[PDB]
Every structure is written in C-alpha cells, then in structure tokens.
Amino acid sequence: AMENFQKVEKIGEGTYGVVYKARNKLTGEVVALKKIRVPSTAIREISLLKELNHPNIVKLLDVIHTENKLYLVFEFLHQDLKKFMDASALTGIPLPLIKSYLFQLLQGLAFCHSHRVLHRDLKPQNLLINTEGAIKLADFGLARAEVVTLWYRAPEILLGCKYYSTAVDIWSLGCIFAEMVTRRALFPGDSEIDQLFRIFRTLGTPDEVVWPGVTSMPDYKPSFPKWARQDFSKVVPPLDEDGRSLLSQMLHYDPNKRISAKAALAHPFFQDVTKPVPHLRL
Ligand SMILES: Cn1nccc1Nc1nccc(-c2ccn([C@H](CO)c3ccc(Cl)c(F)c3)c(=O)c2)n1
C-alpha cells in the first residue's frame, strides 16, 4: 500500500493526523499524503468525497485503507493562504486578487453545498493556492467523516446548535475575507467564550430582533453582556461599499438570513472580478 509512496517532507499536522509531501513511486506523481490517526461509516463518507470533484476543491486522488489504517492521497499545492497572507502582510494582498480568491471559494462552496456537503472548518491553512491564480478548499467533508482554532467558527456552533447548516461555511469565509483585507484576524478568540464575546463586541450581542430563536439556543445565557453593534466602516477599512455590503450579508447572525454562496456569486462586488496571478516565491 504505502510502499508505493516515498515521503519527501512534512507539510502539516492536525489533531488526528500528519500530512506529508510525497512521491507516487508508481505514477511519478507528487502528492500530499495525509496519514489518519477504521469505522465503516467513515469509509463510505470518504468514498463519497472522492466523487465531489471541482476545480476549487483539492482533489482526493486515492483513499488507501490498509493494515487497518487510513491514508488519503491529495493533489499537492505549493502554498496555503496563511503563508501567503504572512508573506504579503507588509503590503497586503491586492484587492483584485482578494476578490478573485473570494469568488473562487464561493464557487467551491456553491458546488459542495448544492450536493449537501458542509466543510465546517474553513480557515486559511485549509485554503491552498497555486501559481496560476487558483485557490482551492482542502480538508473538505473530513469533519463529518494542536490547539483547534476557533477564529472562524460561526456563532450558532459556539451557541451549541448540533444541526447547523451550510451557512456556517459562509460565516467562516466572511471572516477570512475580512482578514485578507485588513491583515488582521477579525475575531481571534482563544476560548469558546472569548470567541463568542469578540463576535458580540463587534456585531452587537444578538437578540430576538436580529436572530429569532437565539435566546433559546443550548449555550445561550441571559447573563451574556449586551454590547452595541459597530459599523463595518470601522471594522474593514478601506474596503468599498460593495465589499462591505457583501461581508455584512455573510456575517448575519441568523443563519437563515445569511447569504448563500450562490447568491453571493451574484453580488455586485463581483461585477469586475478578474483572475490575477499571485507573486509566489516557492
Ligand atoms: C506545501 N504546502 N504548504 C501548506 C500546504 C501545502 N500543500 C498541501 N497540498 C495539498 C494538501 C495540503 C493539506 C495541508 C493541510 N491540511 C490540513 C490543515 O488544516 C490538515 C487537516 C487535518 C490534519 Cl490531521 C492535518 F494533519 C492537516 C490538509 O488537509 C491538506 N497541503
């Protein structure tokens, strides 16, 4: 099984696996090999993911289930968005590239969501880029299948909703959009309550007016402090009014009011979208 792969170097770790750059000794392919750690339900879900192919989803090439361990073989990309943001931080990512990346990831999400597949853990480290200007979603579907970052968590998850929706991915992508534009994380919480209260300090403590049902959510407390909302003009300067209007719709508290990926693709912010090429030093 694995004897067919030659490890080159380590490129990631999760709470349950390690990812190596590796070479397929068979095909000559260079790949990302994720070594996990097997429940049959996980096998069938992962198998369904192999069919979920889109230009903005990192391709799952092979699933090897062997010596009762699990290897996932992915398309290799040379950089993630976290590294590209850090590399770009003196100057910032140019707006047309931010806009191209947001549009592409919304295409990725629209495709996944149309097949009822949620990502659930979008973050810059899971967004992979190449020299041609493409950006792709990684780790897609693997959640339903080493401190965990909370920064991009939708508030319905933080408030204990078990049966949340595709809207959680739009919230995460909105947080990443804001971070591209300002070169700072939007809500960098370091615990669940710190995350929730950073959201409330910026967008206002949610109530029944803006989010019907919120006061009955599992981890909602009447004792939450009540902060007023701030203007987006203060939150993501100097993003223009189209970009701010789109971000506001992606960060609506009520997941049912939050914009869908498909609707976001029609937003006027993308009327002049283009596909620039990044400066990548590899
Ligand atoms: C060279 N380089 N630098 C950064 C990324 C890459 N290239 C690359 N190419 C294809 C896939 C991946 C890739 C990376 C990280 N992860 C996550 C990061 O959150 C990850 C989740 C779960 C566990 Cl268990 C893990 F170890 C790593 C991927 O899923 C998949 N990376």
PDB file of C-alpha atoms and ligand atoms in Angstrom:
ATOM      1  CA  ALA A   1       0.000   0.000   0.000  1.00  0.00           C
ATOM      2  CA  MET A   2       2.219   2.812   1.382  1.00  0.00           C
ATOM      3  CA  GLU A   3       5.264   1.094  -0.065  1.00  0.00           C
ATOM      4  CA  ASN A   4       4.155   2.891  -3.252  1.00  0.00           C
ATOM      5  CA  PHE A   5       4.950   6.312  -1.675  1.00  0.00           C
ATOM      6  CA  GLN A   6       8.245   7.997  -0.842  1.00  0.00           C
ATOM      7  CA  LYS A   7       7.920  10.704   1.807  1.00  0.00           C
ATOM      8  CA  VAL A   8       9.643  13.966   0.915  1.00  0.00           C
ATOM      9  CA  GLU A   9       8.804  16.299   3.820  1.00  0.00           C
ATOM     10  CA  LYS A  10       6.194  17.155   6.417  1.00  0.00           C
ATOM     11  CA  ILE A  11       3.746  19.898   5.443  1.00  0.00           C
ATOM     12  CA  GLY A  12       1.048  19.855   8.077  1.00  0.00           C
ATOM     13  CA  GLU A  13      -0.354  18.424  11.240  1.00  0.00           C
ATOM     14  CA  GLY A  14      -3.883  18.122  12.625  1.00  0.00           C
ATOM     15  CA  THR A  15      -5.172  16.850  15.964  1.00  0.00           C
ATOM     16  CA  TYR A  16      -5.563  13.412  14.323  1.00  0.00           C
ATOM     17  CA  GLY A  17      -3.022  13.227  11.513  1.00  0.00           C
ATOM     18  CA  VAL A  18       0.100  14.368   9.744  1.00  0.00           C
ATOM     19  CA  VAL A  19       0.389  15.425   6.091  1.00  0.00           C
ATOM     20  CA  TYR A  20       3.493  14.727   4.005  1.00  0.00           C
ATOM     21  CA  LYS A  21       4.596  15.855   0.632  1.00  0.00           C
ATOM     22  CA  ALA A  22       5.304  12.508  -1.089  1.00  0.00           C
ATOM     23  CA  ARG A  23       6.107  10.960  -4.482  1.00  0.00           C
ATOM     24  CA  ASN A  24       3.956   8.190  -6.026  1.00  0.00           C
ATOM     25  CA  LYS A  25       6.710   5.705  -6.995  1.00  0.00           C
ATOM     26  CA  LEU A  26       4.255   4.266  -9.447  1.00  0.00           C
ATOM     27  CA  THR A  27       2.969   7.292 -11.380  1.00  0.00           C
ATOM     28  CA  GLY A  28       5.830   9.694 -10.615  1.00  0.00           C
ATOM     29  CA  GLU A  29       3.209  11.993  -9.130  1.00  0.00           C
ATOM     30  CA  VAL A  30       3.984  14.393  -6.336  1.00  0.00           C
ATOM     31  CA  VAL A  31       1.133  14.324  -3.828  1.00  0.00           C
ATOM     32  CA  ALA A  32       0.056  15.333  -0.314  1.00  0.00           C
ATOM     33  CA  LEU A  33      -0.296  12.190   1.797  1.00  0.00           C
ATOM     34  CA  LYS A  34      -2.499  12.518   4.891  1.00  0.00           C
ATOM     35  CA  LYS A  35      -1.982   9.735   7.419  1.00  0.00           C
ATOM     36  CA  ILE A  36      -5.038   9.490   9.642  1.00  0.00           C
ATOM     37  CA  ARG A  37      -4.654   8.569  13.295  1.00  0.00           C
ATOM     38  CA  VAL A  38     -11.438   2.371  10.781  1.00  0.00           C
ATOM     39  CA  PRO A  39     -15.219   2.845  11.204  1.00  0.00           C
ATOM     40  CA  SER A  40     -17.167   1.772   8.098  1.00  0.00           C
ATOM     41  CA  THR A  41     -19.341   4.912   8.128  1.00  0.00           C
ATOM     42  CA  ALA A  42     -16.106   6.921   7.794  1.00  0.00           C
ATOM     43  CA  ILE A  43     -15.055   4.695   4.869  1.00  0.00           C
ATOM     44  CA  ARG A  44     -18.298   5.280   2.983  1.00  0.00           C
ATOM     45  CA  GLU A  45     -18.322   9.067   3.645  1.00  0.00           C
ATOM     46  CA  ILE A  46     -14.771   9.415   2.497  1.00  0.00           C
ATOM     47  CA  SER A  47     -15.620   7.379  -0.588  1.00  0.00           C
ATOM     48  CA  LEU A  48     -18.467   9.802  -1.402  1.00  0.00           C
ATOM     49  CA  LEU A  49     -15.938  12.636  -1.129  1.00  0.00           C
ATOM     50  CA  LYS A  50     -13.870  11.114  -3.907  1.00  0.00           C
ATOM     51  CA  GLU A  51     -16.717  11.887  -6.261  1.00  0.00           C
ATOM     52  CA  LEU A  52     -17.023  15.502  -5.152  1.00  0.00           C
ATOM     53  CA  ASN A  53     -14.677  16.968  -7.772  1.00  0.00           C
ATOM     54  CA  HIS A  54     -14.445  20.655  -8.603  1.00  0.00           C
ATOM     55  CA  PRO A  55     -11.644  22.969  -9.819  1.00  0.00           C
ATOM     56  CA  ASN A  56     -11.711  24.788  -6.429  1.00  0.00           C
ATOM     57  CA  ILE A  57     -11.641  21.673  -4.272  1.00  0.00           C
ATOM     58  CA  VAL A  58      -8.323  19.962  -3.632  1.00  0.00           C
ATOM     59  CA  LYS A  59      -8.664  16.680  -5.454  1.00  0.00           C
ATOM     60  CA  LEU A  60      -8.840  13.480  -3.408  1.00  0.00           C
ATOM     61  CA  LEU A  61      -6.823  11.110  -5.631  1.00  0.00           C
ATOM     62  CA  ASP A  62      -6.864   7.888  -3.668  1.00  0.00           C
ATOM     63  CA  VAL A  63      -8.118   6.500  -0.408  1.00  0.00           C
ATOM     64  CA  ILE A  64      -5.996   3.693   0.917  1.00  0.00           C
ATOM     65  CA  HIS A  65      -7.373   1.665   3.695  1.00  0.00           C
ATOM     66  CA  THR A  66      -4.757  -0.796   4.648  1.00  0.00           C
ATOM     67  CA  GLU A  67      -3.151  -2.517   7.619  1.00  0.00           C
ATOM     68  CA  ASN A  68      -6.325  -1.158   9.208  1.00  0.00           C
ATOM     69  CA  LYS A  69      -5.037   2.405   8.903  1.00  0.00           C
ATOM     70  CA  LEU A  70      -6.235   5.231   6.668  1.00  0.00           C
ATOM     71  CA  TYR A  71      -4.218   7.243   4.123  1.00  0.00           C
ATOM     72  CA  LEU A  72      -5.704   9.970   1.996  1.00  0.00           C
ATOM     73  CA  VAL A  73      -3.794  10.950  -1.129  1.00  0.00           C
ATOM     74  CA  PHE A  74      -4.493  14.563  -2.256  1.00  0.00           C
ATOM     75  CA  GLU A  75      -3.414  16.764  -5.123  1.00  0.00           C
ATOM     76  CA  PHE A  76      -0.318  18.731  -3.931  1.00  0.00           C
ATOM     77  CA  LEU A  77      -0.409  22.518  -3.968  1.00  0.00           C
ATOM     78  CA  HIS A  78       2.591  24.590  -3.171  1.00  0.00           C
ATOM     79  CA  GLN A  79       1.308  27.140  -0.667  1.00  0.00           C
ATOM     80  CA  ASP A  80      -1.598  27.795   1.748  1.00  0.00           C
ATOM     81  CA  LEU A  81      -3.370  31.115   2.222  1.00  0.00           C
ATOM     82  CA  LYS A  82      -1.980  31.518   5.775  1.00  0.00           C
ATOM     83  CA  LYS A  83       1.575  31.529   4.426  1.00  0.00           C
ATOM     84  CA  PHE A  84       0.625  33.800   1.535  1.00  0.00           C
ATOM     85  CA  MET A  85      -1.060  36.278   3.952  1.00  0.00           C
ATOM     86  CA  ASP A  86       2.013  36.293   6.215  1.00  0.00           C
ATOM     87  CA  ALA A  87       4.237  36.776   3.117  1.00  0.00           C
ATOM     88  CA  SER A  88       2.017  39.599   1.910  1.00  0.00           C
ATOM     89  CA  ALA A  89       1.500  41.363   5.169  1.00  0.00           C
ATOM     90  CA  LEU A  90       3.731  44.468   4.653  1.00  0.00           C
ATOM     91  CA  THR A  91       1.947  45.388   1.523  1.00  0.00           C
ATOM     92  CA  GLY A  92      -1.334  43.428   1.695  1.00  0.00           C
ATOM     93  CA  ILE A  93      -2.871  41.164  -0.913  1.00  0.00           C
ATOM     94  CA  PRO A  94      -4.053  43.372  -3.796  1.00  0.00           C
ATOM     95  CA  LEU A  95      -7.840  43.826  -3.832  1.00  0.00           C
ATOM     96  CA  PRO A  96      -8.356  42.234  -7.251  1.00  0.00           C
ATOM     97  CA  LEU A  97      -6.639  39.047  -6.020  1.00  0.00           C
ATOM     98  CA  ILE A  98      -8.650  39.098  -2.763  1.00  0.00           C
ATOM     99  CA  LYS A  99     -11.714  39.402  -4.923  1.00  0.00           C
ATOM    100  CA  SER A 100     -10.689  36.543  -7.256  1.00  0.00           C
ATOM    101  CA  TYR A 101      -9.972  34.260  -4.331  1.00  0.00           C
ATOM    102  CA  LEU A 102     -13.249  35.073  -2.599  1.00  0.00           C
ATOM    103  CA  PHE A 103     -15.177  34.436  -5.860  1.00  0.00           C
ATOM    104  CA  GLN A 104     -13.463  31.129  -6.462  1.00  0.00           C
ATOM    105  CA  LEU A 105     -14.027  29.890  -2.942  1.00  0.00           C
ATOM    106  CA  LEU A 106     -17.669  30.877  -3.250  1.00  0.00           C
ATOM    107  CA  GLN A 107     -17.814  28.762  -6.413  1.00  0.00           C
ATOM    108  CA  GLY A 108     -16.300  25.820  -4.443  1.00  0.00           C
ATOM    109  CA  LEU A 109     -18.772  26.308  -1.701  1.00  0.00           C
ATOM    110  CA  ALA A 110     -21.728  26.627  -4.007  1.00  0.00           C
ATOM    111  CA  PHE A 111     -20.804  23.313  -5.591  1.00  0.00           C
ATOM    112  CA  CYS A 112     -20.337  21.481  -2.251  1.00  0.00           C
ATOM    113  CA  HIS A 113     -23.456  22.954  -0.746  1.00  0.00           C
ATOM    114  CA  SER A 114     -25.540  22.002  -3.781  1.00  0.00           C
ATOM    115  CA  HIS A 115     -24.555  18.395  -3.003  1.00  0.00           C
ATOM    116  CA  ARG A 116     -25.409  18.947   0.676  1.00  0.00           C
ATOM    117  CA  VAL A 117     -21.815  18.665   1.819  1.00  0.00           C
ATOM    118  CA  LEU A 118     -20.596  21.132   4.511  1.00  0.00           C
ATOM    119  CA  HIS A 119     -16.954  21.962   5.066  1.00  0.00           C
ATOM    120  CA  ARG A 120     -17.417  23.037   8.745  1.00  0.00           C
ATOM    121  CA  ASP A 121     -13.827  24.135   9.394  1.00  0.00           C
ATOM    122  CA  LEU A 122     -12.724  26.681   6.817  1.00  0.00           C
ATOM    123  CA  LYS A 123      -9.503  28.518   7.819  1.00  0.00           C
ATOM    124  CA  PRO A 124      -6.582  29.982   5.941  1.00  0.00           C
ATOM    125  CA  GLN A 125      -4.488  26.851   6.481  1.00  0.00           C
ATOM    126  CA  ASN A 126      -7.118  24.812   4.579  1.00  0.00           C
ATOM    127  CA  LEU A 127      -7.181  27.140   1.533  1.00  0.00           C
ATOM    128  CA  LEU A 128      -4.449  26.198  -0.885  1.00  0.00           C
ATOM    129  CA  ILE A 129      -3.125  28.314  -3.794  1.00  0.00           C
ATOM    130  CA  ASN A 130      -1.091  27.793  -6.933  1.00  0.00           C
ATOM    131  CA  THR A 131       0.939  29.862  -9.414  1.00  0.00           C
ATOM    132  CA  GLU A 132      -1.905  30.168 -11.850  1.00  0.00           C
ATOM    133  CA  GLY A 133      -4.120  32.170  -9.554  1.00  0.00           C
ATOM    134  CA  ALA A 134      -6.333  29.319  -8.352  1.00  0.00           C
ATOM    135  CA  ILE A 135      -7.382  28.754  -4.737  1.00  0.00           C
ATOM    136  CA  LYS A 136      -8.858  25.523  -3.503  1.00  0.00           C
ATOM    137  CA  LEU A 137     -10.644  24.158  -0.461  1.00  0.00           C
ATOM    138  CA  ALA A 138      -8.824  21.369   1.460  1.00  0.00           C
ATOM    139  CA  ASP A 139      -9.982  19.011   4.221  1.00  0.00           C
ATOM    140  CA  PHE A 140     -13.444  19.212   2.516  1.00  0.00           C
ATOM    141  CA  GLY A 141     -16.071  16.924   4.159  1.00  0.00           C
ATOM    142  CA  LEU A 142     -13.483  15.450   6.534  1.00  0.00           C
ATOM    143  CA  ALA A 143     -15.136  16.819   9.724  1.00  0.00           C
ATOM    144  CA  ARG A 144     -18.483  14.956   9.365  1.00  0.00           C
ATOM    145  CA  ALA A 145     -16.324  11.955   8.444  1.00  0.00           C
ATOM    146  CA  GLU A 146      -2.621  21.300  18.023  1.00  0.00           C
ATOM    147  CA  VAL A 147      -4.986  23.724  19.751  1.00  0.00           C
ATOM    148  CA  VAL A 148      -8.084  23.945  17.479  1.00  0.00           C
ATOM    149  CA  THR A 149      -8.586  27.411  16.059  1.00  0.00           C
ATOM    150  CA  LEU A 150     -11.947  28.972  16.910  1.00  0.00           C
ATOM    151  CA  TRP A 151     -11.391  32.190  14.970  1.00  0.00           C
ATOM    152  CA  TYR A 152     -13.636  31.273  12.095  1.00  0.00           C
ATOM    153  CA  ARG A 153     -16.429  29.484  13.998  1.00  0.00           C
ATOM    154  CA  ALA A 154     -19.988  30.541  13.260  1.00  0.00           C
ATOM    155  CA  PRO A 155     -21.948  31.745  16.318  1.00  0.00           C
ATOM    156  CA  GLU A 156     -24.623  29.016  16.014  1.00  0.00           C
ATOM    157  CA  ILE A 157     -21.875  26.444  16.529  1.00  0.00           C
ATOM    158  CA  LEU A 158     -20.479  28.349  19.530  1.00  0.00           C
ATOM    159  CA  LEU A 159     -24.031  28.575  20.981  1.00  0.00           C
ATOM    160  CA  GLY A 160     -24.323  24.749  20.825  1.00  0.00           C
ATOM    161  CA  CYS A 161     -26.530  24.088  17.781  1.00  0.00           C
ATOM    162  CA  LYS A 162     -25.971  20.406  16.765  1.00  0.00           C
ATOM    163  CA  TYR A 163     -27.724  20.529  13.394  1.00  0.00           C
ATOM    164  CA  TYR A 164     -26.208  23.534  11.764  1.00  0.00           C
ATOM    165  CA  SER A 165     -26.259  24.305   8.088  1.00  0.00           C
ATOM    166  CA  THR A 166     -24.186  25.334   5.033  1.00  0.00           C
ATOM    167  CA  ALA A 167     -24.369  28.857   6.448  1.00  0.00           C
ATOM    168  CA  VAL A 168     -21.507  28.018   8.865  1.00  0.00           C
ATOM    169  CA  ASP A 169     -19.124  27.950   5.832  1.00  0.00           C
ATOM    170  CA  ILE A 170     -20.258  31.363   4.617  1.00  0.00           C
ATOM    171  CA  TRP A 171     -19.566  32.820   8.078  1.00  0.00           C
ATOM    172  CA  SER A 172     -16.024  31.345   8.083  1.00  0.00           C
ATOM    173  CA  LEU A 173     -15.355  32.632   4.560  1.00  0.00           C
ATOM    174  CA  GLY A 174     -16.586  36.103   5.602  1.00  0.00           C
ATOM    175  CA  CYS A 175     -14.093  36.076   8.498  1.00  0.00           C
ATOM    176  CA  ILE A 176     -11.282  35.084   6.093  1.00  0.00           C
ATOM    177  CA  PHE A 177     -12.347  37.842   3.592  1.00  0.00           C
ATOM    178  CA  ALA A 178     -12.108  40.438   6.345  1.00  0.00           C
ATOM    179  CA  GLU A 179      -8.656  39.098   7.376  1.00  0.00           C
ATOM    180  CA  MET A 180      -7.362  39.313   3.750  1.00  0.00           C
ATOM    181  CA  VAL A 181      -8.476  42.942   3.527  1.00  0.00           C
ATOM    182  CA  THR A 182      -7.271  44.242   6.945  1.00  0.00           C
ATOM    183  CA  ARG A 183      -4.272  41.907   7.500  1.00  0.00           C
ATOM    184  CA  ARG A 184      -5.560  41.044  10.946  1.00  0.00           C
ATOM    185  CA  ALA A 185      -7.844  38.287  12.085  1.00  0.00           C
ATOM    186  CA  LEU A 186     -11.389  39.540  12.580  1.00  0.00           C
ATOM    187  CA  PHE A 187     -12.258  37.565  15.714  1.00  0.00           C
ATOM    188  CA  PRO A 188      -9.182  35.964  17.244  1.00  0.00           C
ATOM    189  CA  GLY A 189     -10.719  34.177  20.226  1.00  0.00           C
ATOM    190  CA  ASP A 190      -8.643  31.967  22.437  1.00  0.00           C
ATOM    191  CA  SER A 191     -11.521  30.161  24.137  1.00  0.00           C
ATOM    192  CA  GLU A 192     -15.130  29.499  23.239  1.00  0.00           C
ATOM    193  CA  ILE A 193     -16.480  32.330  25.354  1.00  0.00           C
ATOM    194  CA  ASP A 194     -13.750  34.713  24.262  1.00  0.00           C
ATOM    195  CA  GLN A 195     -14.651  33.886  20.649  1.00  0.00           C
ATOM    196  CA  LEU A 196     -18.337  34.499  21.248  1.00  0.00           C
ATOM    197  CA  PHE A 197     -17.718  37.709  23.115  1.00  0.00           C
ATOM    198  CA  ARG A 198     -15.326  39.057  20.447  1.00  0.00           C
ATOM    199  CA  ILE A 199     -18.129  38.499  17.935  1.00  0.00           C
ATOM    200  CA  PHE A 200     -20.672  40.211  20.151  1.00  0.00           C
ATOM    201  CA  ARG A 201     -18.352  43.198  20.829  1.00  0.00           C
ATOM    202  CA  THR A 202     -18.069  43.849  17.092  1.00  0.00           C
ATOM    203  CA  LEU A 203     -21.525  42.832  15.693  1.00  0.00           C
ATOM    204  CA  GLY A 204     -23.628  43.526  18.857  1.00  0.00           C
ATOM    205  CA  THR A 205     -24.908  40.916  21.308  1.00  0.00           C
ATOM    206  CA  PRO A 206     -27.599  39.078  19.320  1.00  0.00           C
ATOM    207  CA  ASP A 207     -31.168  39.220  20.476  1.00  0.00           C
ATOM    208  CA  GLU A 208     -34.548  38.020  19.265  1.00  0.00           C
ATOM    209  CA  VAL A 209     -34.962  41.014  16.949  1.00  0.00           C
ATOM    210  CA  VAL A 210     -31.970  40.177  14.780  1.00  0.00           C
ATOM    211  CA  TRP A 211     -31.906  36.401  15.400  1.00  0.00           C
ATOM    212  CA  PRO A 212     -35.234  34.836  16.232  1.00  0.00           C
ATOM    213  CA  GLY A 213     -34.703  31.773  18.362  1.00  0.00           C
ATOM    214  CA  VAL A 214     -31.279  32.840  19.663  1.00  0.00           C
ATOM    215  CA  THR A 215     -32.270  33.155  23.352  1.00  0.00           C
ATOM    216  CA  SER A 216     -33.332  29.529  23.365  1.00  0.00           C
ATOM    217  CA  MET A 217     -30.108  28.064  21.930  1.00  0.00           C
ATOM    218  CA  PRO A 218     -28.396  25.429  24.062  1.00  0.00           C
ATOM    219  CA  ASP A 219     -25.486  27.545  25.369  1.00  0.00           C
ATOM    220  CA  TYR A 220     -27.250  30.903  25.254  1.00  0.00           C
ATOM    221  CA  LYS A 221     -27.219  32.676  28.658  1.00  0.00           C
ATOM    222  CA  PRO A 222     -29.436  35.664  29.586  1.00  0.00           C
ATOM    223  CA  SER A 223     -26.442  36.845  31.565  1.00  0.00           C
ATOM    224  CA  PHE A 224     -24.379  37.459  28.368  1.00  0.00           C
ATOM    225  CA  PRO A 225     -23.317  41.087  28.410  1.00  0.00           C
ATOM    226  CA  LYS A 226     -25.198  43.303  25.929  1.00  0.00           C
ATOM    227  CA  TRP A 227     -22.804  45.179  23.626  1.00  0.00           C
ATOM    228  CA  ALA A 228     -23.941  47.525  20.837  1.00  0.00           C
ATOM    229  CA  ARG A 229     -23.034  46.865  17.186  1.00  0.00           C
ATOM    230  CA  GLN A 230     -20.198  48.682  15.311  1.00  0.00           C
ATOM    231  CA  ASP A 231     -20.057  49.975  11.722  1.00  0.00           C
ATOM    232  CA  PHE A 232     -18.292  47.916   9.118  1.00  0.00           C
ATOM    233  CA  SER A 233     -16.663  51.098   8.011  1.00  0.00           C
ATOM    234  CA  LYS A 234     -14.743  50.788  11.304  1.00  0.00           C
ATOM    235  CA  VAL A 235     -14.303  47.012  11.001  1.00  0.00           C
ATOM    236  CA  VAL A 236     -12.784  46.555   7.483  1.00  0.00           C
ATOM    237  CA  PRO A 237     -11.490  49.905   6.296  1.00  0.00           C
ATOM    238  CA  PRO A 238     -10.826  50.674   3.424  1.00  0.00           C
ATOM    239  CA  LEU A 239     -12.978  48.074   1.769  1.00  0.00           C
ATOM    240  CA  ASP A 240     -15.505  49.736  -0.554  1.00  0.00           C
ATOM    241  CA  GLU A 241     -19.240  49.722  -0.089  1.00  0.00           C
ATOM    242  CA  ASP A 242     -19.864  46.697  -2.290  1.00  0.00           C
ATOM    243  CA  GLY A 243     -17.328  44.632  -0.409  1.00  0.00           C
ATOM    244  CA  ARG A 244     -18.743  45.852   2.964  1.00  0.00           C
ATOM    245  CA  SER A 245     -22.327  45.061   1.924  1.00  0.00           C
ATOM    246  CA  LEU A 246     -21.316  41.544   0.858  1.00  0.00           C
ATOM    247  CA  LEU A 247     -19.340  40.969   4.101  1.00  0.00           C
ATOM    248  CA  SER A 248     -22.313  42.173   6.158  1.00  0.00           C
ATOM    249  CA  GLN A 249     -24.559  39.611   4.470  1.00  0.00           C
ATOM    250  CA  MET A 250     -22.004  36.882   5.040  1.00  0.00           C
ATOM    251  CA  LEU A 251     -21.841  37.741   8.734  1.00  0.00           C
ATOM    252  CA  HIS A 252     -25.601  37.931   9.503  1.00  0.00           C
ATOM    253  CA  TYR A 253     -26.254  36.314  12.847  1.00  0.00           C
ATOM    254  CA  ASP A 254     -29.365  34.373  11.743  1.00  0.00           C
ATOM    255  CA  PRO A 255     -28.089  31.544   9.546  1.00  0.00           C
ATOM    256  CA  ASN A 256     -31.326  31.676   7.601  1.00  0.00           C
ATOM    257  CA  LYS A 257     -30.736  35.368   6.717  1.00  0.00           C
ATOM    258  CA  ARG A 258     -27.010  34.811   5.968  1.00  0.00           C
ATOM    259  CA  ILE A 259     -26.293  34.964   2.158  1.00  0.00           C
ATOM    260  CA  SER A 260     -25.855  31.708   0.292  1.00  0.00           C
ATOM    261  CA  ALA A 261     -22.768  31.013  -1.787  1.00  0.00           C
ATOM    262  CA  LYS A 262     -24.843  31.009  -4.931  1.00  0.00           C
ATOM    263  CA  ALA A 263     -26.436  34.358  -4.084  1.00  0.00           C
ATOM    264  CA  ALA A 264     -23.067  35.795  -3.095  1.00  0.00           C
ATOM    265  CA  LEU A 265     -21.698  34.978  -6.552  1.00  0.00           C
ATOM    266  CA  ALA A 266     -24.341  37.399  -7.984  1.00  0.00           C
ATOM    267  CA  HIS A 267     -23.377  40.234  -5.666  1.00  0.00           C
ATOM    268  CA  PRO A 268     -22.338  43.497  -7.334  1.00  0.00           C
ATOM    269  CA  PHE A 269     -18.888  43.218  -5.676  1.00  0.00           C
ATOM    270  CA  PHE A 270     -18.027  40.664  -8.347  1.00  0.00           C
ATOM    271  CA  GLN A 271     -19.146  42.697 -11.366  1.00  0.00           C
ATOM    272  CA  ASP A 272     -15.451  43.428 -12.156  1.00  0.00           C
ATOM    273  CA  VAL A 273     -13.918  40.239 -10.933  1.00  0.00           C
ATOM    274  CA  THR A 274     -10.731  39.068 -12.723  1.00  0.00           C
ATOM    275  CA  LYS A 275      -8.169  36.294 -12.169  1.00  0.00           C
ATOM    276  CA  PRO A 276      -4.801  37.862 -11.376  1.00  0.00           C
ATOM    277  CA  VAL A 277      -1.737  35.819 -10.786  1.00  0.00           C
ATOM    278  CA  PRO A 278      -0.076  35.989  -7.355  1.00  0.00           C
ATOM    279  CA  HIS A 279       3.598  36.583  -6.754  1.00  0.00           C
ATOM    280  CA  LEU A 280       4.573  33.177  -5.259  1.00  0.00           C
ATOM    281  CA  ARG A 281       8.117  32.570  -4.023  1.00  0.00           C
ATOM    282  CA  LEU A 282       8.409  28.777  -3.783  1.00  0.00           C
TER     283      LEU A 282
HETATM  284  C1  LIG B   1       3.179  22.860   0.627  1.00  0.00           C
HETATM  285  N1  LIG B   1       2.021  23.245   1.445  1.00  0.00           N
HETATM  286  N2  LIG B   1       2.074  24.204   2.490  1.00  0.00           N
HETATM  287  C2  LIG B   1       0.881  24.277   3.038  1.00  0.00           C
HETATM  288  C3  LIG B   1       0.016  23.405   2.349  1.00  0.00           C
HETATM  289  C4  LIG B   1       0.735  22.753   1.379  1.00  0.00           C
HETATM  290  N3  LIG B   1       0.318  21.799   0.461  1.00  0.00           N
HETATM  291  C5  LIG B   1      -0.749  20.962   0.540  1.00  0.00           C
HETATM  292  N4  LIG B   1      -1.159  20.333  -0.556  1.00  0.00           N
HETATM  293  C6  LIG B   1      -2.298  19.540  -0.540  1.00  0.00           C
HETATM  294  C7  LIG B   1      -2.943  19.335   0.681  1.00  0.00           C
HETATM  295  C8  LIG B   1      -2.429  20.022   1.812  1.00  0.00           C
HETATM  296  C9  LIG B   1      -3.070  19.997   3.156  1.00  0.00           C
HETATM  297  C10 LIG B   1      -2.463  20.751   4.193  1.00  0.00           C
HETATM  298  C11 LIG B   1      -3.029  20.820   5.420  1.00  0.00           C
HETATM  299  N5  LIG B   1      -4.205  20.197   5.636  1.00  0.00           N
HETATM  300  C12 LIG B   1      -4.897  20.401   6.915  1.00  0.00           C
HETATM  301  C13 LIG B   1      -4.532  21.793   7.515  1.00  0.00           C
HETATM  302  O1  LIG B   1      -5.614  22.212   8.388  1.00  0.00           O
HETATM  303  C14 LIG B   1      -4.804  19.219   7.843  1.00  0.00           C
HETATM  304  C15 LIG B   1      -6.010  18.700   8.274  1.00  0.00           C
HETATM  305  C16 LIG B   1      -6.068  17.619   9.122  1.00  0.00           C
HETATM  306  C17 LIG B   1      -4.891  17.032   9.534  1.00  0.00           C
HETATM  307 CL1  LIG B   1      -4.972  15.657  10.591  1.00  0.00          CL
HETATM  308  C18 LIG B   1      -3.673  17.555   9.112  1.00  0.00           C
HETATM  309  F1  LIG B   1      -2.536  16.959   9.529  1.00  0.00           F
HETATM  310  C19 LIG B   1      -3.621  18.659   8.258  1.00  0.00           C
HETATM  311  C20 LIG B   1      -4.803  19.439   4.698  1.00  0.00           C
HETATM  312  O2  LIG B   1      -5.878  18.897   4.942  1.00  0.00           O
HETATM  313  C21 LIG B   1      -4.232  19.313   3.415  1.00  0.00           C
HETATM  314  N6  LIG B   1      -1.374  20.834   1.717  1.00  0.00           N
END
